Each structure stands twice: as structure tokens, then as C-alpha cells.
Write a protein that binds this ligand. Structure first.
Ligand code: SF4
Ligand SMILES: [Zn+2]
Ligand SMILES: [Zn+2]
Ligand SMILES: [Zn+2]
Lengths: 265, 714, 329
């Protein structure tokens, strides 16, 4: 059946982001659309489920020279006393049937945590210890020793923006939307490319997808510079180099791992 | 876990016993030491049997000569099956401590219908039909014909059992009904008769009350062999009803019409016999001159001479005359008639039937029936019922009454009148138990006060002990809601039953409670007719719909088939998160039969005091006699029946294992001191005055709080 | 007992009408949402590598309020929005569990899958039987620890114990915090649960090289403006505004060094300190930990450093700091 065609119509305009990027892959005629998707009331219903007699009646009494309003009328329609008990037990039973479809841890080296991932004679301790011991026999020099006008002023100058220890542009906005669209475009298609890359997948069926994905990386990125060229030749300002890293680094990973494949063989 | 009781050292399998258990064993030992019949109450349904059983095992070993055998009876076979498991567990623990087998045998008896291995009776389920087939297979003629080894199906299991079962008795072991059936199959012996033989030497024998009360069957299997036996009843609070029902016999127009047709078949059978077999069968007349069982107890039973009735032609006319008198006396249209001694005089004068010849009619019928080589007794079973009634009236009527109902209740005019012979005192049928057995312990739960039982049953108990369960956590949280949100009397009085507010209040209570009560809840009404009216009133209003939205609701009907299916669905709902509200009648067979455990009937609701229709004459005769004799007020007994019965159905939620469960009484009457006094000790003492008159909404709030405390673990 | 360092827990909340009832001081639904915010904020504050996803089940339908994520702020924002939720309907436990199972079915083996169901309405109307789902959950090694509200419902009782989780009920609002606070800690890994090594990358924060020379402008990765500097990836080479965030491309977890060091206190729980009320030859009137006079007859001591700690110090140490001050020496 044409299941895919119906799915495309539902998402054709309901969600812009999903369809927007898929078309872009075909706007420039990059690759076929087959690989795109291949890789990636209540009251009547309750009676419909609950009472089988109504279900049988509805099929046989399907609207024919009648009205739905008339059908609704037919719903509500000592011996009579027993009917309530039987109906409720039957009704309750039908509801029930309707909902029933047929290690202590141990370690060898705990010191490593104490000196964790963060990376990096004897007489000197004695000599230093004695010297400091006699240092504070004179105390309360606060009057002048703590600070001086020159020392204090020098600190203020340093704290100034020009001074040391105090080091200290949204012009493009319309282009921002295109980059975000491109960022999603890159993010959308790298995801599939990187979906199988981390896993070695030493199998032809799984590896074939890598080869198709690996080749598809060039096809998608073949059209990328053309759009980049137009944007770049506007003012030569606010260069976009980050977007190149994802494609260039994707190439390097592709080339390196592809080269590594030959070595393994 | 050996217990050094004051009387002796008693082995106990489980880890710990509550303080009430210490009182239980010593109290039981006191009666056993005194060798006198007594009555006691213990709340816990589970653990009571083992505690009761544990002392007997220790007592038997300490004083084997004092007590011969243990006769522990249970109300229903499904409940006796779990009892033997407790005994089996205890035996293994006791046997493990000893380290070797001991001369101890335990088994449970039952009807051939429930247990058997013969294929022919397997498809049949009716109890009467099973006996007819088994009797025919085991009939003397078949046994005599079995010797000839002619071409005819002979039940092999009994034939080889007599040659084998008689010679070798089973040394020891515990065999439940399911296990016993397998043993018979492998050994090719009757699971029924083999157990019957074992009663001669069986330390513990357990069976239902109907095997120990009705003289027709109980006497034969309960022979004097048990000169000094510790006979015990379990949950025998409604012992009188079972005991009285055994004596009570009902004769109806439909039954009478069947008897007339059966009698005609009996006449035809005699005619065939006369032309075919006369001399050989006539020898039984000499046996009769020389000199299904009679319902007369030991002393009452008489076998002096057959009397005037000595031949089939003469005896059949005797029944023909008696049947006609009952037929005419039953067809009379008038108010309900009572005539215990006058019926015998009226029958004797009307159709010239002396009582003494009539006393042996039932026994003569069986003897004559045997001579007829009938195919089965099931077809003629109604005739025997009339014969049993025929002899019972002619035997004694001091503590009995013949009640005739030309018009039945619930029908403006019915052409099927029923002749009732309901008894009035249960002491008559239970009397032989007390003399034959040195001591009887009536152990029961939800027991309304003991002092009445000696009045109802003519006996002198050694002790009257009431036990309240003692636990680290207060499992049961009873309450009475006599006032609703409208602060209006909610009593389900007969005159006040028609009140819409009272009906509305019950719906409000159930609706609100269902919101807080987790999966599993049961509601008990006073009668089916009242239950339908309350359901209909809720159905017309939105209360029932809201209850349905809150939880699933199930109602109970008279037919068992609907009840069984609905109950099975109920248990399914509790297992899932849907939950179910099972509306039932307190006096309905469903309530007594079913047991409620953890997450089953969590909040048992007692809608109104359970009372029977006072217009029922049969109850009046029973009620009137208790006022006439034994000095019991008419209202006292009527309240007693409700209080004892109300506690019966609501006490299941605390079965055992300290599974939290609350009980709510939706009636201000229970708050009355008289009702509380008749309330069982364990339920009564926990109940306090502060929560005695909780409002419908106030009761809900505390119920929610109660669940919180019980919800958390220990 | 070895714990599950990385866990994927789902906080299933019932949108049942019973939540409308106000047994507690505020509305029950608001109280759960208010306190659930504390758990969500605290859950990541004590387990960064873990991730959470909330589900709200109302009108017999289970809708994913928020997917699995590592940012408490996003989840907290949904909680604020959910305050004004209609809260009208009946929950479906099967629907909720089925939704979680689908998302959690594909989760890696190393992670410790978990589920926390806040059960309010005792009724549970479901399209199909749940026992079959219960069997699937055990095979899926998903720990479901329901927390009932005002009901010890049987259906959940079997769920927690059979599935390996824990069931609880709210005695009161104060007790409510303790129950969820308990689940903050990584639950111990049972015999059935297994463990495996997990690949991760440490994103070195980078800024403009030298006065905006060879700059790296970019906006974000899930109205973000251009950023002079931001976290990058060893493999994505994508600008991530904040950490820890799973690679939108690699699928490899990115996490800073301090975040991993945050959970080390779980591995080395501090031994409880014996409480002796009397002085017991303790000549130091001032508490060693806080240098404060002991106005109460209470003292705490280690088994190694053998120091003195008042009630306030011992409470603080075993509550937040998760280490003995003096015993570090
Ligand atoms: S004789 Fe034994 S085996 Fe045969 S029908 Fe009777 S009880 Fe069953
Ligand atoms: Zn990455
Ligand atoms: Zn301190
Ligand atoms: Zn220390």
C-alpha cells in the first residue's frame, strides 16, 4: 500500500522543520528521497467497545434512510427489577472484558580518586619554620606598613580597563536565520552520517550503509560551498568558520577511518 | 518452637504465638483436663486450627488413653481441605523433631459425589444421582451377581477393596481429598470407603457437620467406638441452623406428585417381581418377622417389630393412605397451620393409621426397597423423603411442629404449596453427640455471647472464654456510621427502609468510601428485595454512575451460576487496578461460602442490621418455642441472630497474616449498647466510643487515615 | 553494594481527578508538582550523568510531558506550566508503562533504567492486561518504584516488589519529601542488573583565540544569538551552550570533570558516627567541627580520626558535605 505517501501528506505542512530540511536535500538535486525515510466521539466509542450488541446493530443498522439523531434515541431504550441487576453485572463484566484484550562493591586503588584526573630540601622546612617563628614578635604595623599611597594607587591603575588584571556585535541578524537553518541542515544530515560511524559494524549489511553514508557526505557537502559562496560575497564581515569545521572534521574522520579500514584489511 | 504449657510441653511449628494463644491452649487444656464439653471463641481463622490442633497432639501423646481420636469438623469441604494442610504442616514439623515416623493418621471424609474414581459417576455432579449409581454398583445383588461373574458392569474398586482394604489398614499418613483420590486410583480402592474403614484407627478424622449431626448418616459412621473422643467444631456459630436443618423436612406438592408417580412405579415393580421372583424375595418377609437410613437418634430409634405393614402389597397401601392424607391436608387452603401433636392424631383418626406401625415405615421402606432390586434410589428419593417425614412425625413432636403453607410468600396465589416440618430446638438432634462423646469443643469465630448457647443447646460448658487478638499493630479498625452528612437517622428499619434519604445515605457512604478504599470491597444488604430497591434507587440517581466511575460494581443474585461467575470476575478486578464493589446479601449463600483475604473485601460494609422477614411463620415457631422454653426473650434471640450473623460475614477481612482491613457498619442500631454487647469481643473491644457514631464523611476521613498507617510497612 | 552510576528514571505522575482532592495543605496536584520540582532539581544535583523524562497520564492517556534530558531547568519549566493543567480524567498504568518501555527499550545496557510512578487515584483503567507488561518489564530490567498517595493499592504492591522496585505511601507532606529524597540516591544494582563501560568526552571550553582572531562564531545547539565562545566536542565540533548534554550527532555523552567528581561520594559513603550523650573524657568544650560550645548532651566520633562533632556538625556532614572534616587530615 501507499503508506509512505499518506505519511508525507500529513507532515507536508503540519510540521515545517521536518519537511523544510528534507526538501533542501532535493532543492539542489543532491540525492534521491528514497534514502531519506528509509533510514529514518468518546461516548460512542465507549459503547462501541463495551456493548457487542450495539456493535452488531450498528453494522446491520448502518445509516440507510435514517438519521444519527434517531439512532441516539434508540440507545436509552418484579421481572423488570431483575433487569437492572443483570444489566449492571453484564455491563460491568463487559467493561472488564473490554479492558482485557484476547552486589557488594570493592576496589583495589582508591587513592587515585584522591589525586584525581586533575594533573600536577628537608632543612629548608626547618630553616623556614624557625625564621617565621621569630617574624611576628613585632605586630600591629597597620599604621603604614599595610598600605601606602603609591602601592594603593598602583592597584587602582591596574584595576582600570587599561591596567593589568582587568582585561575587560549583533550587526548581522537576517543572516542568522539562514545559518540556523543551515545549522539544522547540518545537524539533520550529520546525525545519520554519525549514526553508524562510532560503531565499527564489521558486517557488510551494516557496513554498506556506512559506504552509502560516507559517499553521501560528499554529495551533501558538495552543494554546501555554493550556498556559502553567496553569503560570503556580501560584505566579507562576520566570517562563518565554525560551520566549516563540522564538514571538514567530518571529512577528516571519514578519510582517516576509511584509511584505517585499508590498514585493517 | 516448643511451648512449655502449664499442663504439659506442646510442640508448635510457627515461630511465635500471641499472648491470646497462651490463653487459648491453657483454656482448652482446662476443658480437656476436666473432660467436659465447652465452648470458646478465637478471632483468627488461620492459626486457630494449628493452635487447637497442636494441644491435641501434645495432649494425645501425654494422655493417649484419655482421648481416643480427634473429630474436627468444618462447615464446608472447600474450607476443610485447607485445614488438613495445617495439620500436614504440623505433622512434618513434629515428625522432624522426633526424627522418625509416629503412629499418627489423619484423613478427611466426604461424599462420593465430591471424591470418587469410578468413571460412570464422574460426569454426574448431583449428589443424589451419585449415591443411586454407587448404591446400585455396590448393591448386594450386583455383589452377588459379581460372584457369578456374568456379563454386567461391576465396580471393580469396591470389589477388590473388600478383599484388600479389609485385610490391610493404612499404617499412617496424611491424605487430603485430592491426595486421597490419587491413592485410591493407584491402589484400586475407594477413596470414600477406604477413609471410612480408616475411621476405626485414625488419630484425626475431619468432616463436615452433616456427617456428624443428621442421625441418618452421622450415627453409622460415628458409632460408639469414639467412647472418649475430642469432637470439635470450627466456625460453628450457625450450628443450630445446620443442626435444625438436618431434622427439618419439607414436603411439597411437586414432591408429593413425584411420590405418587414413584409409588405407581413401585407398584409396577412389585407386579413384575411377583411374576418373576416370588419365593426368594418372599424370604425377606421372614427376615422382617424375625427382625438412606432412619433419622431417629440412638435412643429415639426403635426396631422392635415391623408392625402391621409386613408385605409389599400391604405396605404400599399404607403409604398410599398416608400420601393421600398429606395430599388432602396440604391442598387445604387456609392460614398457616401448626399442629405438632394433632397431626399424628388427625392422621391416625382420619385414615386409621396408628403411630407405632407408622414409626417403622421409613425403615420398612428401605428394607422393602432393597427387596425390589431397583435400578437406583435417585428416582424414588422424594418418596424416601416423605417416608423420613412420615416416621419423624410419628416418632416424637414435643420439640417439633408441622407447618402447612397453602399459599407461599412472594406470590399472590401459587398452586405449589409446601408443608414445613421445621424444628424448634437444636438440642434434640445434637443431644447424642454430647453423651456419646465425653467432651465437645465448639470453637468458632465472630461468636455472639457464649452464655446463650447453653440455653439454645442443652449442655453445661466447662468454660466460657472470649479471646481478642493481640498484635503489635492494630489490624482491624471497626466503626459504625449511624449518622450521615444530613445528620438523619440511617437505621434500615422496616418502616424507615422506604426513606429516600436513608437509601441516599448508603449510596453516599459507598460512593465516598469507594474513593478512598483500595481495590477490593464488599457491601452486605439485609435482603435481595431490599438490595434491588437500593440498587434501583441508586441507578435512577447519579450515585450509582459515580460509584461505577470510582470503581467497578458487582451485584449478587439467587442463582449460584451468576454468583460464581461474578465472584470470579470480582477477584480479577482486585488483582488489577480496577477494583470491584460486590453487593451481596448477608444471609445469602455467597457471603458465608466466600472468604475475604488481603486486598479482598478491604472495607466490608454492613448496610443495615441483617434481619429476616418476621412474617415467616417457620421462624415464628422457632422463635416462639425459644420464648416458651429456655427463657429467651423474642427480641433478644432475633437481635442475637442478626448480631451473630452480622459478625459472621464481616469478620472475614481479618482472616490472618495481619492483613489490614476495616469494617464499617452503616446503621445507628449497632451503636446501641445491646448490639455492641452481642458483638464479638475482638471486634467489640477494639471498637471505641469516640468512633462509634462517626459521620459518613467523618468515617471516610478516618478510613483514609487508617489506611495510611497500615499502608506503611512494619 | 555497587550502585547504578548512570540511571534513566521516569517520573510518571497521575493526572487523575483524585489529585484534585486537597488532603494536604495546598492542592494535592500542586503539592506534588511543587515537590517534584525539588526532586528534579536535586536529582541532577546528585547525579549529573543521569537523565530524566517526565510523563503525565490523564484521561486514560499517557502523554510524554518531557523527553529524556540532562537540563533540570527545562524539566522544571514544564512543571510550572503543568500547574494549570486541567487534571480531569482517569489514569492508565498500562498506557504510562508502555510509553516508558518504548523509550527505555533502546537504552544502552550499562545504564540503570528506572521508573517512579506517583500514584494518586487507586483506580487504574487500562486498555489491556498489565501482568503481561509486568513480565516484559522484568525482562527489560526496568525498576519501577511506585509512590502511592493515600492508598496501598494491590496492583502497585506487586508491581514494585515483583519488578524489583519499592512501593511507598504518603503518611504526610513532610514524609513525602523523605520518600522522593530517598530515590535521589542511585538505587543499588541487583544481581540481574549488569554494568558496562561507557564512552564519554570532555568538552574543553574555548573562547576567541587572540582578540577575535580566527574566531568561531555560532549561535547554539538546542532565539540564541552568536556566541564568542562555547563548549565544543571531540567529534561533533558543535558549539554546545551548556553541559552536560548528550551529543546531538555522536550520541556520546559530554560531561565536565567536576560533574563526575560530584558522584564520588556515593562510592565512598561516610561511616556513621557513634552517638554518646555523656562527655566521655571529651575535654574539648567547643565542638571541633564548628568550634562551637556544646549546649546538648550529644557527641559524634569517627572510627579513625576519633574527633568530636556536635549534632549540628554530624547532621551537616552526613547531609550535604558527605565527608568528615577533621578525618580528611
Ligand atoms: S463403589 Fe467406590 S469407586 Fe465405585 S462408585 Fe462407589 S465410591 Fe466410587
Ligand atoms: Zn559529539
Ligand atoms: Zn559542631
Ligand atoms: Zn573522621
Amino acid at each position: 500500500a501507499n503508506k509512505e505517501l499518506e505519511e508525507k501528506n500529513r507532515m507536508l505542512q503540519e510540521d515545517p522543520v521536518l519537511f523544510q530540511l528534507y526538501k533542501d536535500l532535493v532543492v539542489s538535486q543532491v540525492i534521491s528521497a528514497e534514502e531519506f525515510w528509509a533510514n529514518r466521539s468518546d461516548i460512542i466509542e465507549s459503547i462501541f467497545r463495551t456493548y457487542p450488541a450495539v456493535k452488531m446493530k450498528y453494522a446491520e443498522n448502518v445509516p440507510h434512510n435514517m438519521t444519527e439523531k434517531e439512532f441516539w434515541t434508540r440507545f436509552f431504550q418484579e421481572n423488570s427489577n431483575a433487569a437492572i441487576i443483570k444489566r449492571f453485572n453484564h455491563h460491568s463484566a463487559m467493561v472488564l472484558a473490554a479492558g482485557l484484550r484476547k552486589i557488594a562493591l570493592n576496589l583495589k586503588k582508591s587513592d587515585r580518586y584522591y589525586h584525581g584526573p586533575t594533573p600536577i630540601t628537608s632543612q629548608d622546612i626547618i630553616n623556614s619554620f624557625q625564621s617565621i617563628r621569630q617574624e611576628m614578635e613585632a605586630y600591629t604595623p597597620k599604621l603604614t606598613q599595610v598600605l601606602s599611597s603609591s602601592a594603593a594607587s598602583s592597584t587602582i591603575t591596574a584595576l582600570s580597563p587599561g591596567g593589568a588584571l582587568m582585561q575587560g556585535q549583533m550587526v548581522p541578524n537576517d543572516i542568522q536565520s539562514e545559518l540556523k537553518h543551515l545549522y539544522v541542515a547540518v545537524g539533520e544530515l550529520l546525525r545519520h552520517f554519525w549514526s553508524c560511524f562510532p560503531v565499527n559494524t564489521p558486517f557488510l549489511e551494516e557496513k554498506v550503509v556506512k559506504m552509502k553514508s560516507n559517499l553521501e557526505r560528499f554529495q551533501v557537502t558538495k552543494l554546501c560551498p555554493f550556498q556559502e559562496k553567496i553569503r560570503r560575497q556580501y560584505l566579507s564581515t562576520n566570517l562563518v568558520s565554525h560551520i566549516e569545521e563540522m564538514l571538514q572534521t567530518a571529512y577528516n574522520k571519514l578519510h582517516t577511518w576509511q584509511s584505517r579500514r585499508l590498514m585493517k584489511k | 518452637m516448643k511451648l512449655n504449657v502449664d499442663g504439659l510441653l506442646v510442640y508448635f511449628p510457627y515461630d511465635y504465638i500471641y499472648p491470646e494463644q497462651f490463653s487459648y491452649m491453657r483454656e482448652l487444656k482446662r476443658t480437656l483436663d476436666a473432660k467436659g464439653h465447652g465452648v470458646l471463641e478465637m478471632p483468627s481463622g488461620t492459626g486457630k486450627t494449628v493452635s487447637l490442633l497442636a494441644l491435641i497432639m501434645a495432649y494425645q501423646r501425654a494422655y493417649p488413653l484419655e482421648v481416643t481420636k480427634l473429630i474436627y469438623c468444618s462447615r464446608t469441604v472447600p474450607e476443610i481441605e485447607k485445614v488438613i494442610e495445617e495439620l500436614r504442616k504440623l505433622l512434618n514439623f513434629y515428625e522432624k523433631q522426633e526424627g522418625e515416623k509416629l503412629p499418627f493418621l489423619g484423613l478427611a471424609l466426604s461424599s462420593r459425589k465430591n471424591l470418587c474414581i469410578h468413571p460412570e459417576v464422574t460426569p454426574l455432579r448431583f449428589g443424589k444421582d451419585v449415591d443411586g449409581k454407587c448404591h446400585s454398583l455396590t448393591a448386594s445383588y450386583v455383589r452377588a451377581q459379581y460372584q457369578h461373574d456374568t456379563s454386567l458392569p461391576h465396580c471393580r474398586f469396591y470389589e477388590e477393596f473388600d478383599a484388600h482394604g479389609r485385610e490391610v489398614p493404612l499404617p499412617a499418613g496424611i491424605y487430603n481429598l485430592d491426595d486421597l483420590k490419587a491413592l485410591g486410583r493407584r491402589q484400586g480402592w475407594c477413596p470414600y470407603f477406604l477413609a471410612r474403614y480408616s475411621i476405626l484407627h485414625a488419630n484425626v478424622v475431619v468432616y463436615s457437620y452433616h456427617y456428624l449431626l443428621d442421625p441418618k448418616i452421622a450415627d453409622l459412621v460415628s458409632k460408639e467406638l469414639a467412647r472418649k473422643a475430642v469432637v470439635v467444631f470450627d466456625e460453628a456459630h450457625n450450628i443450630d441452623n445446620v443442626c435444625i436443618d438436618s431434622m427439618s423436612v419439607n414436603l411439597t406438592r411437586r414432591t408429593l406428585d413425584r411420590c405418587q408417580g414413584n409409588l405407581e412405579t413401585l407398584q409396577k415393580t412389585v407386579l413384575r417381581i411377583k411374576e418373576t421372583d416370588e419365593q426368594r424375595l418372599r424370604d425377606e418377609y421372614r427376615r422382617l418377622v424375625e427382625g438412606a437410613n432412619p433419622v431417629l437418634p440412638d435412643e429415639v430409634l426403635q426396631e422392635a417389630v415391623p408392625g402391621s405393614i409386613r408385605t409389599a402389597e400391604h405396605f404400599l397401601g399404607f403409604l398410599r393412605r398416608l400420601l393421600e392424607y398429606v395430599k388432602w391436608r396440604l391442598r387445604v387452603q387456609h392460614v398457616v397451620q401448626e399442629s405438632p401433636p394433632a397431626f399424628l392424631s388427625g392422621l391416625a383418626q382420619r385414615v386409621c393409621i396408628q403411630r407405632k406401625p407408622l414409626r417403622f415405615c421409613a425403615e420398612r421402606l428401605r428394607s422393602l426397597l432393597h427387596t425390589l432390586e431397583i435400578t437406583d434410589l435417585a428416582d424414588f428419593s422424594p418418596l424416601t423423603l416423605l417416608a423420613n417425614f412420615a416416621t419423624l412425625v410419628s416418632t416424637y413432636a414435643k420439640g417439633f411442629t408441622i407447618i402447612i403453607e397453602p399459599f407461599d410468600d412472594r406470590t399472590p396465589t401459587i398452586a405449589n404449596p409446601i408443608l414445613h416440618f421445621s424444628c424448634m430446638d437444636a438440642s434434640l438432634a445434637i443431644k447424642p453427640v454430647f453423651e456419646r462423646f465425653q467432651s465437645v469443643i465448639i470453637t468458632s469465630g465472630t461468636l455472639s455471647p457464649l452464655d446463650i448457647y447453653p440455653k439454645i443447646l442443652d449442655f453445661h460448658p466447662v468454660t466460657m472464654a472470649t479471646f481478642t487478638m493481640t498484635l503489635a499493630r492494630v489490624c482491624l479498625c471497626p466503626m459504625i456510621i449511624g449518622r450521615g452528612n444530613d445528620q438523619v437517622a440511617i437505621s434500615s428499619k422496616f418502616e424507615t427502609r422506604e426513606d429516600i434519604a436513608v437509601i441516599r445515605n448508603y449510596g453516599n457512604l459507598l460512593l465516598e468510601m469507594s474513593a478512598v478504599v483500595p481495590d477490593g470491597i464488599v457491601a452486605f444488604f439485609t435482603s435481595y428485595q431490599y438490595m434491588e430497591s437500593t440498587v434501583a434507587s441508586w441507578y435512577e440517581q447519579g450515585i450509582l454512575e459515580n460509584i461505577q466511575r470510582n470503581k467497578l460494581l458487582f451485584i449478587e443474585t439467587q442463582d449460584g451460576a451468576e454468583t460464581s461467575v461474578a465472584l470470579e470476575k470480582y477477584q480479577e478486578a482486585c488483582e488489577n487496578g480496577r477494583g470491584a464493589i460486590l453487593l451481596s446479601v448477608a444471609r445469602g449463600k455467597v457471603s458465608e461460602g466466600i472468604d475475604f483475604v488481603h486486598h479482598y473485601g478491604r472495607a466490608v460494609i454492613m448496610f443495615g442490621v441483617p434481619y429476616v422477614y418476621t412474617q415467616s411463620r417457620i421462624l415464628k415457631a422457632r422463635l416462639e418455642y425459644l420464648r416458651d422454653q429456655f427463657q429467651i426473650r423474642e427480641n433478644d434471640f432475633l437481635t442475637f441472630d442478626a448480631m451473630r450473623h452480622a459478625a459472621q460475614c464481616v469478620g472475614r477481612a481479618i482472616r490472618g497474616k495481619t492483613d489490614y482491613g476495616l469494617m464499617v457498619f452503616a446503621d445507628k442500631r449497632f451503636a446501641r449498647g445491646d448490639k455492641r454487647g452481642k458483638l464479638p469481643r475482638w471486634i467489640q473491644e477494639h471498637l471505641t466510643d469516640a468512633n462509634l457514631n462517626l459521620t459518613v464523611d467523618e468515617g471516610v476521613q478516618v478510613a483514609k487515615y487508617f489506611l495510611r498507617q497500615m499502608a506503611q510497612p512494619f | 553494594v555497587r550502585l547504578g552510576m548512570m540511571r534513566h528514571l521516569y517520573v510518571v505522575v497521575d493526572g487523575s481527578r483524585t489529585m484534585e482532592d486537597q488532603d494536604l495543605k495546598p492542592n494535592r496536584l500542586t503539592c506534588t508538582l511543587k515537590l517534584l520540582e525539588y526532586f528534579v532539581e536535586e536529582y541532577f544535583d546528585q547525579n549529573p550523568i543521569s537523565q530524566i523524562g517526565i510523563i503525565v497520564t490523564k484521561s486514560k492517556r499517557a502523554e510524554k510531558l518531557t523527553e529524556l534530558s540532562g537540563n533540570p531547568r527545562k524539566h522544571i519549566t514544564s512543571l510550572k506550566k503543568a500547574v494549570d493543567m486541567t487534571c480531569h480524567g482517569e489514569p492508565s498504568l498500562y498506557n504510562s508503562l508502555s510509553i516508558a518501555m518504548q523509550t527505555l527499550k533502546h537504552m544502552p545496557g550499562h545504564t540503570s533504567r528506572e521508573v517512579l510512578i506517583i500514584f494518586s487515584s487507586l483506580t487504574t483503567c487500562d486498555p489491556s492486561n498489565i501482568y503481561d507488561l509486568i513480565k516484559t518489564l522484568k525482562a527489560a530490567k526496568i525498576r519501577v518504584s511506585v509512590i502511592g498517595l493515600s492508598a496501598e493499592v494491590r496492583v502497585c504492591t506487586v508491581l514494585a516488589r515483583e519488578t524489583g522496585g519499592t512501593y511507598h505511601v504518603i503518611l504526610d507532606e513532610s514524609h513525602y519529601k523523605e520518600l522522593l529524597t530517598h530515590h535521589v540516591s542511585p538505587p543499588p544494582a541487583s544481581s540481574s542488573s549488569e554494568c558496562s563501560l561507557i564512552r564519554m568526552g570532555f568538552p574543553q571550553h574555548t573562547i576567541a583565540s587572540l582578540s577575535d582572531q580566527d574566531a568561531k562564531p555560532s549561535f547554539s545547539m538546542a532565539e540564541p544569538g552568536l556566541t564568542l565562545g562555547g563548549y565544543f566536542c571531540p567529534q561533533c565540533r558543535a558549539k554546545y551552550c551548556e553541559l552536560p548534554v548528550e551529543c546531538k550527532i555522536c550520541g556520546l555523552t559530554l560531561v565536565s570533570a567536576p560533574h563526575l567528581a560530584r558522584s564520588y561520594h556515593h562510592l565512598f559513603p561516610l561511616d556513621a558516627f557513634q552517638e554518646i550523650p555523656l562527655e566521655e573524657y571529651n575535654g574539648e568544650r567547643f565542638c571541633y567541627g564548628c568550634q562551637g560550645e556544646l549546649k546538648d548532651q550529644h557527641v559524634y566520633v569517627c572510627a579513625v580520626c576519633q574527633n568530636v562533632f556536635c549534632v549540628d556538625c554530624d547532621v551537616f556532614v552526613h547531609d550535604s558535605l558527605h565527608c568528615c572534616p577533621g578525618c580528611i587530615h
